[PDB]
Every structure is written in structure tokens, then in C-alpha cells.
Amino acid sequence: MEKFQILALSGGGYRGLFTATVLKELEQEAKENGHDSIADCFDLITGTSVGGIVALAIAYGIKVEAIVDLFKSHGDKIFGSKYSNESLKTVLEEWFGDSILGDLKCPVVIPTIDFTRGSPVTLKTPHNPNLKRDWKLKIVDVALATSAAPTYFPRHPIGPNEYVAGGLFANDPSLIGLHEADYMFKKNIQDVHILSIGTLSSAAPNIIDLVLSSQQQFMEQMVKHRMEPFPNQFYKIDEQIVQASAQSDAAKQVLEGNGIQSAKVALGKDFIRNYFNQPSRKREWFDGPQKNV
Amino acid sequence: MEKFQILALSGGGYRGLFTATVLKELEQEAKENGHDSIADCFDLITGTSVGGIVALAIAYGIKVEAIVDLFKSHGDKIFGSKYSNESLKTVLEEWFGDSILGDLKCPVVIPTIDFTRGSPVTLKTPHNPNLKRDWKLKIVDVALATSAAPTYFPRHPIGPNEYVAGGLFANDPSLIGLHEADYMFKKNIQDVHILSIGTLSSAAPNIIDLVLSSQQQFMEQMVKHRMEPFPNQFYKIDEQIVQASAQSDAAKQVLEGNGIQSAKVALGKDFIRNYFNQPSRKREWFDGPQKNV
Amino acid sequence: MEKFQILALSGGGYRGLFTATVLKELEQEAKENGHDSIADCFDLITGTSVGGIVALAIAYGIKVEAIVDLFKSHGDKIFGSKYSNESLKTVLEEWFGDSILGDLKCPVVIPTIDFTRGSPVTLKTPHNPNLKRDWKLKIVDVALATSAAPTYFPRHPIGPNEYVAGGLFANDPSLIGLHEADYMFKKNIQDVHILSIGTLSSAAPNIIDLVLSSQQQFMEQMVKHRMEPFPNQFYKIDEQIVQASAQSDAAKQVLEGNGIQSAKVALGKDFIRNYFNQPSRKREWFDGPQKNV
Amino acid sequence: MEKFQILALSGGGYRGLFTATVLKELEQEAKENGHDSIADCFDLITGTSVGGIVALAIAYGIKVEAIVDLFKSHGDKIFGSKYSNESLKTVLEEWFGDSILGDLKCPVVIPTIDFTRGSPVTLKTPHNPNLKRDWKLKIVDVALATSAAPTYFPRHPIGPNEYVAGGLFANDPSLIGLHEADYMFKKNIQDVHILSIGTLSSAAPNIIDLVLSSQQQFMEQMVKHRMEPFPNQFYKIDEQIVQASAQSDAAKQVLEGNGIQSAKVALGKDFIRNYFNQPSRKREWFDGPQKNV
Amino acid sequence: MEKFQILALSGGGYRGLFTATVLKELEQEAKENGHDSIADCFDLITGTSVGGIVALAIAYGIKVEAIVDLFKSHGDKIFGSKYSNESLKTVLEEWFGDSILGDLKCPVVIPTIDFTRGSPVTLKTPHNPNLKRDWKLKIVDVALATSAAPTYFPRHPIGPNEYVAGGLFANDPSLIGLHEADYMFKKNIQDVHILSIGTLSSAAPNIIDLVLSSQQQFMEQMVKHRMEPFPNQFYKIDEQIVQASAQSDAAKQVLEGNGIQSAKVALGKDFIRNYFNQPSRKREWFDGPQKNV
Amino acid sequence: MEKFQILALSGGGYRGLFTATVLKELEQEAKENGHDSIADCFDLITGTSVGGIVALAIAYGIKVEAIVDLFKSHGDKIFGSKYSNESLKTVLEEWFGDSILGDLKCPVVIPTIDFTRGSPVTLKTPHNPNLKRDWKLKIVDVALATSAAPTYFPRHPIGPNEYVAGGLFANDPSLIGLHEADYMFKKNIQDVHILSIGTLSSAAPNIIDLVLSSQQQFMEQMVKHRMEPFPNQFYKIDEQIVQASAQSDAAKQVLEGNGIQSAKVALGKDFIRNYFNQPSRKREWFDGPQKNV
Numbered sequence A, B, C, D, E, F: 001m002e003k004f005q006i007l008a009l010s011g012g013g014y015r016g017l018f019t020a021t022v023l024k025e026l027e028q029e030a031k032e033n034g035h036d037s038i039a040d041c042f043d044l045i046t047g048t049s050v051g052g053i054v055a056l057a058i059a060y061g062i063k064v065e066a067i068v069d070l071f072k073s074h075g076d077k078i079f080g081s082k083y084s085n086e087s088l089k090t091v092l093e094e095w096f097g098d099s100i101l102g103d104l105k106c107p108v109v110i111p112t113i114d115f116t117r118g119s120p121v122t123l124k125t126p127h128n129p130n131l132k133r134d135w136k137l138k139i140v141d142v143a144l145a146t147s148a149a150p151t152y153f154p155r156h157p158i159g160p161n162e163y164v165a166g167g168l169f170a171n172d173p174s175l176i177g178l179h180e181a182d183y184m185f186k187k188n189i190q191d192v193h194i195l196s197i198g199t200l201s202s203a204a205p206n207i208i209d210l211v212l213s214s215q216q217q218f219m220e221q222m223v224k225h226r227m228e229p230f231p232n233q234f235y236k237i238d239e240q241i242v243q244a245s246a247q248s249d250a251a252k253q254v255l256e257g258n259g260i261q262s263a264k265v266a267l268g269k270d271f272i273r274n275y276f277n278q279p280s281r282k283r284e285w286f287d288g289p290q291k292n293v
């Protein structure tokens, strides 16, 4: 019985700068405890849309300084269909290149919707004997697929199928982490610790937004309910202070400051600090270039 | 350790003649085994959309002949905002009258969205010591709230709040049943048996439909995954034969016939027949006129 | 032994209708458990600003239906110096009349500032042998003094001294409740249960607002810190859902609905329900018309 | 059980010279009893405003002769927004340089307000296992942030956030000392000894001053009330003689003389002399350049 | 061993309204405890100058409502030599008439200076076998002698001698009370309880004022020193709040309000309330019309 | 129980030749009984005005021949502001030099007034654990401060404060001796023996003189009253013969003859002779260079 820790990077658009600021501060705590990256402290990383461009980068081993550098120097240009995806593609090739999803150092689950069939899809690494087809994809294509919503980006054809943004259906990536730890990893729920670094989003479009918000809250409350018998085993690092804030470079200042303050609040809790004071986790890859089993 | 059985009536619009026909066919077994209604064989009833109306009618003790009579004699008229809700209101008062949600004979969970706050809400009978405010509502108002979607019906103001249809977020009422049996009834998942009598539904609206279908499938697959270690403990009575059917009174014929065939297929499985061959279930009401504890 | 329960009503201006709604739904539980009013379940009541006109009304025995009737029928007119205190005065005489502060059924602490000396003052019922001069005041004058701020109301001269609103300094009436239970009631902090039904408020004025908000948060966090070793012994019923609300009669609707939802959430927690299921509180008055000791 | 002694320096503006004269006299006793500085006799140092530039200097190990030299040779120049923070900045770099807040020899708590979020903040040395982010700051920036009020100094941007003066909210640094000894140090209140070397300050601005004075007195009286059961465990060295004084170099004379007289009065009390006749205090740093634990 | 209680009415000029208001509030406590006047709770009453016009009135049995009526309706006119004492004489005859000093109900000591010899004199009632010549004087003449200072009033010739104001030498009437209790009443100092209701006063004249203030403080500190071994046996009701007051009818308001607040503070202390909860004191007159021995 | 003997040198101006002559005559008995100086027979020495100078000289160990030499050879020159203090300063440096007040061989109390604050001050040797700041002063500065009255000498700035003559307030140094022996030495009054070698002094100035004389007599009579139960324990060596004398070198003759006659009268009383026939007193210094405890 050792703790199965999940990092559920929730977010959307340009508020992602909050998610990368909270992650630069948490990273420091990992280093100071002797880890190579913040991806060595977690057994699973789940993200949706932009949270997936950060989740893949975290698991690949990318320094969080560059994930933040993306949002405060390239954030305007990146974040036909109101965007052309070319700058995002350039930065992602800059980062990854031609690496496949099986080259990640941490198991990830990237939910997304198959527009062709119109059905949920999850792009996962080979962390179970049964996952054998998603480790061959370009990390660039996975990143372009997860962060591709209608009226935001053209749908990305990874292969024969067209995929849209994952936040449309699985707007909470903390239910995916808990579910994946319950059926792929056969983990008892008492051993699951979820850290969800999410953020709040900023007649028909009104209805779509209402449905999306309601569907994120429904799944978040389900995760909170399943983790109530075990105290402090699900903690969400949200900017609950911006809603209490009595008061785009200025917006960068507010986002950065909110991220730093939320990470400071989180590091003051011993159970959050206990995510990073452990021996480096050992992975079990069942396929791909890093096959251990 | 006795089996906690859940009835998850999934349904949308007129295809409800399928859900009411399968329920009318299962009533036959329920009575032949010596029960008063099909609501005496289940510990929880969850439904969204028209399923909610059928779920409330099932739990209230209404004969399933009249629930079917609603769909093949009043189905066209009932199923500004393309409908006026007056015929549905008349039939619901005809059925219920001025009964409160605490007069139900079976615990129910009716998910719905608070349009005012734009957040998930569940209307629940007083079945837990913690449910103390939803047993006072009109069953008519609950039925008008659950089956009230934009472009279908005006939003129903039960009280100070306006509510929209529950199928928008909790499109699968079998995840609600399983969760309730986990966070309210403190039931071990091996003791939970879910019977989901659902049916298949018939650029922006395309995206909304895709998102709704994807969100129903995601939650359905989560329920199927959590119930795989226990064989045959989650069975869905779906019209998987209409998709294999090589070929509005005619539509009534197809819906009825499909319901009868699906119920015939279900009754051929001993584990489905074991839902109805048990002593009548004893309820524990913690508030309202039927308070037992 | 006996749990010392405190009700810390925080309410500024028109969003007092939230405080009056949460208390109409908490009195229901109070009556359903067999109490005469919601003032029989608490051993101390503290309010500042409108929370004091509600705190005095609660302790006097006024039905909470009329406290709500004040905010949705007289709220605009009541809430020179932008407001003639005459309306409130009429409603307060219609409620109280010529009753003195010693006629209250529950000990209250009403903080306020002496503008003459410019120093903190607390108007308290004679609930300690050392309180002997504030039980002689008009409840009407106390209510007009607590809810009297510059640029809102003229300063009220209760006697030879002029008093201004208490929210200016003691913006959190939950630190006053905890302190009074600590220095007047000689209560061990483990026996103190605080229920704070507050609400969020809506270059020099900016600085004043910033200072007031900072001073409310500082004292609130001090109360939260002193009550962390004892779980769930300080619960604040705040409209944390309006800050999550994706969406003046309309404002009345939002305030009412938020109050009802927050009270519903609070009543779902057993420790909140345990405030009202206890034997009636026996008072010890050490002076005034009701001196029992 | 050994005494936990707190030094709560309160000093607004030029009447800080009082706080420096009282300290130089109290350091004499400190040295005569065999200590290196007056920071070796205390287990916590709290300060607000100028009292924070003195509190940091005391804890850093700066000789109190230079803290007094600041007020009688540089006091006019230091004490757009009526004051260019440049002078103070030069003197603070001349004192500290590039030392971080983790290089202090005594735990300090410097309250301040985050203008960006508009919320209370406390800059603390790493004296608890939960304080891990404020030991990295420049002492110069902390000093420029604590002593930065509107209409006095421009707001100081330590990092991504702008901070204003701490005296605006936490005008009494003796409630902060008592609270920190209660929630961070887990100290029994009978073991806490507070020595507060404060001083008295000299239509809208009138209201702001009234609110600030009322908020200082409220918190001071709360500290006095919590420390009444333990005699002489909270002593405030205030210039209560200048208000009894029957009668800017002349002002320097009055301030100096008042400080010397108040320190003489304080040293005549054996319980004050017992703060300095003890073995040197041993610190427990849980992070930073001096981490011992 | 029963407590010997002394009332030392210190005061001066028109601030006497403070002393008369603190005494109306303390009187109420005497009545509420069942005494005829505030002169039945004390064994000795010492006053200087105006405090003597109040001390004589208190001991004579005059209602304190009229002593206050003197200061807020006749205060300007009463308070050649800037002030011909005709109005004061009229009001004193109105009060007393032709009563001798031996008709007082409480022993009093009125210090004064014999201008003829230029030596201290005390006008005392026959409360010792050795006091046999002062009980024959007019109370009007004693009142006109005690409140008669140069540059204020002409010197009053009671008999063959001219007398000036007593505040010139015995500016503190609490040292006189303690001394009398020590040599006339042969009381142990542990049994002496002094309640001093005084107030603060508002090149050669500067020197005279400095000397007078220094001589009042010297004697006050001597009384405080002799009463330190016995806690709370010397309490001075001073307006220490007007020196902390951040802010001639207005002056009447401040004086009255300060008196009411100081009396409220005093009545909150159980040892002050214990002055009035005792059986009525029994006097021993050794000469005059009320001779008991 | 051994006798606590006090020497209260009262004096003013050149009449100080009486005190110096009486002291020179008592030195004869002191030496004839085997003591080093007249300061070895007393436990405390209190003086005001020129008495302070003589008191400091007596305690320092100065031969009384030189104290008399000051008054009959330098008396005219020493005794802007009618004097320049330079001759007195020269003679005092001649005597003391750079010795601090802690180098005295006998505890002394020198009353004086702080002109800055306008409050009583006493300069005391470190004779109690609580006296820790007056032993560092120059004896020359103490002597120049005690003997510095307006219209006589410029005010002497010992440090940051200006001091005036002590005879203005504490015109009788025998009440100071008795009080000190009561509040600092914790001596029973039956063990206190006071020997007061004083002398009689020679429209606004008339009032000042009257007040000063009245204040000296008031305190003298208080000392006489407190020492009546113990016979001959307070004896004042006054020139009561010059007032009976039926009849500036001639004035020197009268002063010295009166001193010799008064000392002759005093030495004829056995209780005065018993001050000097005792073993040398042992001092307890609690601070300064002579610290014994």
C-alpha cells in the first residue's frame, strides 16, 4: 500500500498561465526534495484541452520555466476558426519534435472527442497490458487534438479520424484520473491522492456555456463525494482568491500573482508537501520503446 | 448483505414509448412474483428527461398501463419554445394532483440544472438523514422541471429558482444511481445491481448534440467499467435491435414492438428475473410524512 | 460540557436579504425540533450593520417572516446623507416599540463606534455580572446606531454620545462572538460552536473599501485559525455560489435563491443540524427586567 | 514550560523615534545580562509600518544605535505620493544589502496588505514547517512594502504583486504576536509574554483616521482581555506621559525624553527585567539558509 | 475588620461636570443596592475647591441630579477677580441655607489655605474627639472658602480669617483621605479603600501651573505607592479617555459623555461594585447636633 | 529589627549655613563614636534645594569642613536668571569631579521636577532592585539640577530633559525619606527614625511663596502625624531660636551661632545621641560599581 498520486491539470485558454505558475512553485518543492521534475512525484497526469498541452509537457520532462514562457510571451498569438494553430504547432515541434506518446516519463490520460464518430476517446500511454495503439502517435498531434475546439481551432486529423477539444465532454480531468486509477491500475480508492490544479473559465452560446459549466461541476462534485471518506485526499488548487479579489500585461500580473499565492497556500498544507517527499516512482510500461514488463 | 437494486430509466422524448413498454412488460413479472408494483422491487429509481416523469410515476405507485397510455394517446401533443407544457401539466395533475415528493413509495433521484446559478441539482426523496428540503416540492413541478429543455419547453420556476432539463448534464441516470448507492446509501459496489432501461436518441446544434451524446457515453462507460468485476450486475435494456432493424402510428408500432422484444430478451436472463423474486423491500424515510426513523 | 453556540450574523445593506432567507430556513429546522424561535438554540448572537437589526430582531423573538418582509417590500426605501433614517425608524418602532435591550431573550453583542470619543463600543445584554448600563437602552436606538454609517445615515445620538456603524471596525461579528465566549462566559474554546451567516459586500473611497475588506478578512482568518483544532466548530454560511454563479426584483430573486440554496447546503451537514436538536438554552441574566441570578 | 516572549513594535511615522529610544534602553539591560542583541531575548517580533523597519532591523542583528541614528539624522527626509521612497531605500540597502528574510536571527511576522487581491498578507521567517515562500524575499523589499501607505509612499511591487502598508489593517502588531504564538507555535497562552513598544499617532480623511484608530483599539483590547487571567503578561510601553505632558529638533527632544522616561518606568518592573535575565533563546528554523530542524 | 471606604472627589472649574456625572451613575448603583444616597456607602469624603462644593453637597444628602443641574445650567455664570461669587452664593444658599457643617451625614475633610497666616487648614466634621470647632461653620461659607482662588474669586472671610482655595496646596484630596483614615480613624491601611473621582485640568503663570500639577502628581503617586501592596484598593475614575479622544454646549456633551463612559468602565469592576452592596454605614459623631458618643 | 535612620537635609539658599553648621557639629559626635563620616550613621539621605547639594556631599564622603567652607567664603557669589551657576559648577567639580551617582557611600533621594514633562522626578542611588538608571549621572549635574529654580538659575539639561529645582514641589525632604523607607526599603514605620536638619526661608510672587510655604508645612505635618505613635522618632533641628531672637558677615555670625546652639540642644537629647553610637551600617547596592547583591 503506497499512495497513488494523480495530477489533474484543469484549465482553459489564457488562464492557463495560472496552471503553469502553480506548477513552477510546486516543481521547486519537488526539486528541493531531490526529484528531477514534477513528473517524478505522480503516477498519473490527466489534462483537458490546454491542460493537455501542459500535462504532456510536464510528463515529457519539459522544464516548467518554458511552459510558463509559452503563456507570457506567446500567449496572445496562440490563445478561419479565429485561430490558425500554426504558432502553437511551431512551439510544440520546438518542444517535442518527432517524439511519440510512448516516450513520456509519466502515464497520462488525454480525453478528447472523435468528431467523426462523435464519441469520447482517451489518448493514453501504454501503462496497462490493454493499451497498445496510442503510444505511436505524435505528441504534437495529441497536443493539437486536445486543444482544438470549434470556433477556436480547426479540427485536427491525427489519422483517418478528426478530433475536437477534450474539454467539451471531460471538462474535469480529475474524474478521469480517479476512474483510471480505479480500473486500469486496480487501485483502492483510499490509496488515491488527487491534486487538481484547475482554473475558472472567463442565446445558444449561453446555453452551451451553461451546459459545459454544469458538466464540469457535476463531475467535480462526484470526485469530491467519492473522496470524502478519506480526508484531504482530493485537493484542488483553484484561484478562489480572484473571485474574492476586490481589484494584457496587467492580466498577466493578476494571473501570475494568483498562481503564486495559490501555490503558497497549497505548500502550507503538510499533505500537499507529502506528495514530493517520497522516493522516485517506478513506472511499468507494457508496450512502446520503454517496455519494462 | 442483500442486493441493492437500482432502476435507471433513461429516455428522451417520444422514444419513451420504449421505456414505458419495457416497464409494462416487467410489471408482469413483478406482479406474478407477488408485488404491488414495479417500485417494490427496487431500492432507488433515477431518471432524467421524460425518464424522470416515468420514474416519478413508477415510484408514486401509478399503474404502468397509464404511463403507456400517455405516450400512445397524448404523445404527439405533449412531445413559444415549440411547446406550451399545458397538456403535460394537465396529465400530471390528473396523475399526481397536490402530492409532495415525500409521498413516493420508492427513493428517487431526479437530476436537473439550476439555470439561475447554472449548476447541477438533484431532487431527492428524504432517503438520507441529510435530505431535508426536496420532499416538500410538488411532484408536478419536479416533473415539469426535469422535462424542460431549451427549444423544447419554457424553464420551470419551481420556487425562486428556474430549472432546465436534467438530460443536458446527467444524460445517463445510471451513474447517478451508482453514485447515490455509494455516497448516500453506503453500499458496497458488489451489492449494487443496476437495471438501465434506456433508449437511443433520434453547425452549433450539431456540436451540442455531439457533446450531449459524448457525455452520455462517457458516464455509461464509467458505470460499465466500475461494474465489470461483478458479472451481470449492470444490464442495460436498450433497443439494440432497432439499429439492427432492416426495416406516427407506424412509429408507435415499431417502438412498442421493440420494447416488447427487448423485455422478452431481458426476462430470458435469470439474473434479471431475480430482481423481482424477492421479499418486498423495506424503506427508511428520514423525513416527510412517511418518516420511519 | 454544554456546547456554547454562537450565531454571528454578518450583513451589509441590501444583500441582507440573504441573511434573512438563510435564517427563515434554519428556523424551520428550529421549530421542527420543537423550539419557539431560532433564538432558543444559541447562547450568543452578534451582528454588525444590518446584521445587527437582524440580530436584535432574532433575539427579541420576532418571527423571521417579518425580517424577510422588511427586505423584499421595504428594502429599497430603507437601503442629507443619502438616506433619511425615518423609514427604518418607523419599521423598528412597529417591531419593538419602547422595549429596552434587557427584554431580549438571547444575549447579544452589538459592536459600534463612539464617534465622540472615536473608540470601539459594544452594546450588550446583561449576560455577565459586569454588564449594567446597556440593558436600559431602546432597542430602536441600538438598531439605529449599529446601522448608521457616514455617507449612508446620520450619526445616531443614543444619549450624550453619537455612534456610527459597527461594521466600520468590527466588520466580522464572529470574532466578537468567540472573544465574548472567551472573556465573559469563561468558556473553553472546544465548547464554542460558531455559525456565521454572512455575505459578501458589493481613490480615497477605494482605499477605505480595501481597508474594510482587509480588516474583515483578517479577523475572519483569526477566528478560522483558533477553531482549526476542533473540526467543524466554525461554519460560515456564505454565498460562495454567487461568485460561482455563471449568471431590483431580479436581484431579489438571486438573493432569495442563493439564501435558500446555502441553507439547503448547510442543513445537509449533521453538525449544523445538531445546533437545533438540543434542549432549550437556559439564560442567566444578572440585571434588568429578567434578572434570574 | 518556558516563557514565550514576544516583542510587538508599533511605530507610525516620526513618532518612531520613541520606539527606538525605548529599545536602545531595553537593549542596555539586554547586554548587561549577557546577550548579543535585544533579539536574543524574544521568540517573536511583530511590527507594522515603521515599526516593521525597526522589527526587521532588530531581528537582523543591527545595533539599535543606528536605528535611532536613522530617526534623528534622516527622519525628516524619509518621514508624487508626498515621499520618494528612494531615501529609505538607500538607508535600508546600507543596513541590509542583499540579505534574504531567512537570514534573520529572530522569527518575525510583518503584516501587510496585498493591494492586487486586496487581502491580508503576513511576511514571516520560516519558523513553522508550513512557512516556505517568504524567506526568499529581500529584507529591503519587505521593509519598503510594510512602510508603504497611500498618500505616503508608492505601492511597492515585491514580485508580481503590489503591497501597501500593514498598519492599515493590522494596526496592532500585538494581536499578531499572540495569534502566531497560538496557531503556529502551539503555545499555551499562560506561557506567552508580550511586550508592546507602541506609540500614539499624531470629512473622508477624518473617517479613515477614526476607523484606523478604532481598529487598533479593538485589537489591543482583545489582546488585553485574553491576557487578563495572567497578571503582567502583556505590558505596553506607551508614551502615556506625553498625554499628561503639561508642555523639529524640539520634537526630537520630547520624543527622546519620553522614550527614555518610559523605558526607565518599564525597567523598574521586575517582570520586564525578567525578559532579559534568561539563557539565550534557541531557534528552530524549518527552511532557508539556517534550517536547523 | 470592615472596609473603610473613602470618596476623594478631585476636580477643577467647569470640568466638575465630569465629577458630577460619574457620581449620578454611581449613585444609581447605591440606590439599586438599597441606600438613600451615595453618602451612605462611604466613611469619609474629601474634596478640594469645586470638588468641595460637590463633596459637601454629597454628604449633606443633596440629590446628585441637582449637583449636575448646577454645572449644565449655571456652569457658565459661576465658573473684580474675574468672578464675583454671587451666583454661586445664591445657589449654595438655595441648596443648604443656614445649616452648619455638623449637619452633614458623612464625615468630610475640606482642605484650604489660611491666607492670613498663610498655612494649611482642614475643615472637618466632629468625627474625632479632638474635632470641636469646625462643625459650627456655615456650609455656605465652607463652600465659598474651598472654591476661592486668586484670579478666580475674592478670598472668603469665614470669620476673623481669610481663606483661599484648597486646591492650591492639597490638589489631591486622596492623600488627605488616606492620611485622615490613618491618624484620625486609626485604620489599618489594608482596610482603606479609596475611590478618587478626579479630572485633568485644562512665564510666571506657567511656573505656577507647573508647580500645581507637579504637586498633585507627587501626592497622587504617594497614595498609589502606599496602596500597591493591596490590589485594587485605590481606584481613580479619571477621564483617561479624553486624552485618547481622537475628536459650550459641545463641551457639555464631551464632559457628560466622558463621565458616563468612565462610570460605565468603573461599574464593570466587581471591586467598585462592592463599595455599594454593603449595609448602611453607622456614624460616630463626637460633637455637634448629631452627637452619638 | 534595627533602626532605619534617615537624614532629611531641608534648606534654601544661604540659610544653608545653619544645616552645614549643624552637620559639622554632629560630625563631631559621629567621629567621637568611631565613624568615618556622618554618612555612616544613616540609611538614607534626602534633601531638596541647597540641601540636595549638601546631601550629595555628605553621602559622597566629603568632609563637612568644606561644605561649611562653601557657605562662608563662596556663599555670596554662588547664592540672565540672576545667577550664572559657573562658580557653583566650579566648586562642585572641585569636590566631585567625574564621579557618578553610584559612587555614593549612602543611599540618597534627590527630588526635582522635570520641566519638559512638568512632572516629579527623584534621582536615587541604586538602592533597590528597581533603581537602574540614575546611578549613571554626574553628581555635578544632579547638584546643578536640584539647586536650579526659575529666577534663580537656568534650568539644567542633565540629558535630553530639562530639570528645575526640587524644592518647588517636594519642599520637605522628610516626607520623601519616610515614603522611601516605606515603599522601597519595606521598613515598618516603628523602625524609622528621621532627623530633619531644616531651616526657615527668608501679588503673584506673594502667592507663589504662600503656596510653597503651605506645601512644605502640609507635608511636614503629615510626617509629624505618622510618627506621633512612636515618641521622638522624628526630630527636626530647626532654628526655632532665630524666631525667638530678640536681636553679610554679621548674618554669617547669626547663622553659625544659631547652628551651633541648635546642634548643642540636639546633642543634649539621648535619642539624638543614639543615632551615632551604633555599628557602621552595611549597604546593599543592587547596581552600579558598588554592586553587593
Ligand SMILES: Nc1nc2c(ncn2[C@@H]2O[C@@H]3COP(=O)(O)O[C@H]4[C@@H](O)[C@H](n5cnc6c(N)ncnc65)O[C@@H]4COP(=O)(O)O[C@H]3[C@H]2O)c(=O)[nH]1
Binding pocket: A109, A120, A121, A122, A123, A124, A125, A130, A131, A132, A133, A134, A135, A175, A176, A177, A179, A180, A181, B218, B221, B222
Ligand atoms: N485509450 C486507448 N484504448 C486502447 C489502446 N489499445 C487498446 N485500447 C482499447 O480501446 C478501447 C476503447 O478505446 P477508447 O479509449 O477510445 O474508449 C474508452 C474511453 O472513451 C473511455 N475511457 C477510457 N479511460 C477512461 C477514464 N480513465 N476515465 C473516463 N473515461 C475513460 O472508455 C472507453 C473504453 O475504454 P476501455 O479501456 O475499456 O477499452 C479501450 C481499450 O481496450 C490505447 O493505446 N489507448
Ligand SMILES: Nc1nc2c(ncn2[C@@H]2O[C@@H]3COP(=O)(O)O[C@H]4[C@@H](O)[C@H](n5cnc6c(N)ncnc65)O[C@@H]4COP(=O)(O)O[C@H]3[C@H]2O)c(=O)[nH]1
Binding pocket: A264, A265, A266, A267, A268, A269, C218, C221, C222, D109, D120, D121, D122, D123, D124, D130, D131, D132, D133, D134, D135, D175, D176, D177, D179, D180, D181
Ligand atoms: N505568510 C506565509 N504563508 C505561507 C508561507 N508558505 C506557505 N504559506 C502558507 O500561505 C498561506 C497563506 O498565508 P497568507 O500570508 O497569504 O495570509 C495569512 C495571513 O493573512 C493570516 N495570518 C497568518 N498568520 C497570522 C497572524 N499571526 N496574525 C494575524 N493574521 C495572520 O492568515 C492567512 C492565512 O494564513 P495560513 O497560515 O493559515 O496559511 C498560509 C501558509 O500556510 C510563507 O513563507 N509565508
Ligand SMILES: Nc1nc2c(ncn2[C@@H]2O[C@@H]3COP(=O)(O)O[C@H]4[C@@H](O)[C@H](n5cnc6c(N)ncnc65)O[C@@H]4COP(=O)(O)O[C@H]3[C@H]2O)c(=O)[nH]1
Binding pocket: A221, A222, B109, B120, B121, B122, B123, B124, B130, B131, B132, B133, B134, B135, B175, B176, B177, B179, B180, C264, C265, C266, C267, C268, C269
Ligand atoms: N439534493 C438534495 N440535497 C439536500 C437536501 N437537503 C440538504 N441537501 C443538501 O444540499 C446539498 C447540495 O444540494 P444539491 O443537490 O443541489 O447539489 C448536489 C448535487 O448537485 C450533486 N449530487 C447529489 N447527489 C448526486 C448523485 N447521486 N449523482 C450525481 N450527482 C449528485 O452533489 C451536490 C452536493 O451533494 P451533497 O449531497 O453532498 O449536498 C447536498 C445536500 O447535503 C435535499 O432535500 N435534496
Ligand SMILES: Nc1nc2c(ncn2[C@@H]2O[C@@H]3COP(=O)(O)O[C@H]4[C@@H](O)[C@H](n5cnc6c(N)ncnc65)O[C@@H]4COP(=O)(O)O[C@H]3[C@H]2O)c(=O)[nH]1
Binding pocket: D264, D265, D266, D267, D268, D269, E218, E221, E222, F109, F120, F121, F122, F123, F124, F130, F131, F132, F133, F134, F135, F175, F176, F177, F179, F180, F181
Ligand atoms: N527614581 C528612579 N526611578 C527608576 C530608576 N530605574 C527605574 N526607575 C523606575 O522609574 C519609575 C518612575 O521614575 P520617577 O522617579 O521619575 O517617578 C517616581 C517619583 O516621581 C515618585 N517617587 C519615587 N520615590 C519617591 C519618594 N521616596 N518620595 C516621594 N515620591 C517618590 O514616584 C514616581 C514613580 O516611582 P516608582 O519607583 O514606583 O517607579 C520609578 C522606578 O520604578 C532610577 O534609577 N531612579
Ligand SMILES: Nc1nc2c(ncn2[C@@H]2O[C@@H]3COP(=O)(O)O[C@H]4[C@@H](O)[C@H](n5cnc6c(N)ncnc65)O[C@@H]4COP(=O)(O)O[C@H]3[C@H]2O)c(=O)[nH]1
Binding pocket: E109, E120, E121, E122, E123, E124, E125, E130, E131, E132, E133, E134, E135, E175, E176, E177, E179, E180, E181, F218, F221, F222
Ligand atoms: N481641622 C480641625 N482641627 C481642630 C478642630 N478642633 C480642634 N482642632 C485642632 O486644630 C488642630 C490644628 O488645626 P488645623 O486642622 O487647621 O491644622 C491641621 C491641618 O492643617 C493638617 N491636617 C489635618 N488633617 C489632615 C489630613 N487628613 N490630611 C492632610 N493634612 C491634614 O494638620 C494640622 C494639624 O492637625 P491636628 O489634627 O493634629 O490638630 C488640629 C486639631 O487638634 C476642628 O473642628 N477641625
Ligand SMILES: Nc1nc2c(ncn2[C@@H]2O[C@@H]3COP(=O)(O)O[C@H]4[C@@H](O)[C@H](n5cnc6c(N)ncnc65)O[C@@H]4COP(=O)(O)O[C@H]3[C@H]2O)c(=O)[nH]1
Binding pocket: C109, C120, C121, C122, C123, C124, C130, C131, C132, C133, C134, C135, C175, C176, C177, C179, C180, C181, D218, D221, D222, E264, E265, E266, E267, E268, E269
Ligand atoms: N459594553 C458594556 N460594558 C459595560 C456595561 N457595564 C459596565 N460595562 C463595562 O464598560 C467597560 C467598557 O466597555 P466598552 O463597551 O465601552 O468597550 C469595550 C469594547 O470596546 C471592547 N469589547 C468588549 N467586549 C467585546 C467583544 N466580545 N469582542 C470584541 N470586543 C469587545 O472592550 C471594551 C472594554 O470592555 P470591558 O468588558 O473589559 O469593560 C466594559 C465593561 O466592564 C454594559 O452594560 N455594557
